[PDB]
């Protein structure tokens, strides 16, 4: 394993945070 | 407690993906 699963979900979460941040500041 | 975290992140990631989808075109 469950720790590996959380690691993968967090890695994905951080990638999506930064992508939204880039897209928010860009259009807004 | 770990499986609780998995569900928490799934929902968070889903909402983030929905923002990415909208804020792309818009």
């Amino acid at each position, epitope marked *: 394993q469950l*720790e*590996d699963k959380v*690691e*993968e979900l*967090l890695s994905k979460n*951080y990638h999506l945070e*930064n992508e939204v*941040e880039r897209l928010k500041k860009l259009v807004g | 407690q770990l499986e609780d*975290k998995v569900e928490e992140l799934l929902s968070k990631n889903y909402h983030l993906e929905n923002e990415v989808e909208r804020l792309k075109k818009l």
Partner: nanobody
Amino acid sequence: QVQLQESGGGLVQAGGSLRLSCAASGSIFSINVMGWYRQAPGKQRELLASITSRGSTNYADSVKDRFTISRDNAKNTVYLQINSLKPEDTAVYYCNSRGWTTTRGDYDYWGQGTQVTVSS
């Protein structure tokens, strides 16, 4: 607690390449994501690449085939190979250590970064 120190940057001709190093001090937690970001002056910070404890990697699409993240075979050190550098790649490159633990919750630690300056 965790403390990171980047190195390997500096001045470089366009067309060159660098291996940046992030040396990690302190506890290596069981849930951890090491990431490389960069920030140009004025611009927003940009996640380039991530690696988990088990070696699973995650790249920003724009650099997936030019930059490569990896971990030393033995040392508590992660690397970012940045190839085919162009003036647009000038920035401070930062390392970060991020995750969650059943005991203390979310954590997030930043290096101070290494400046890369690509000249032409």
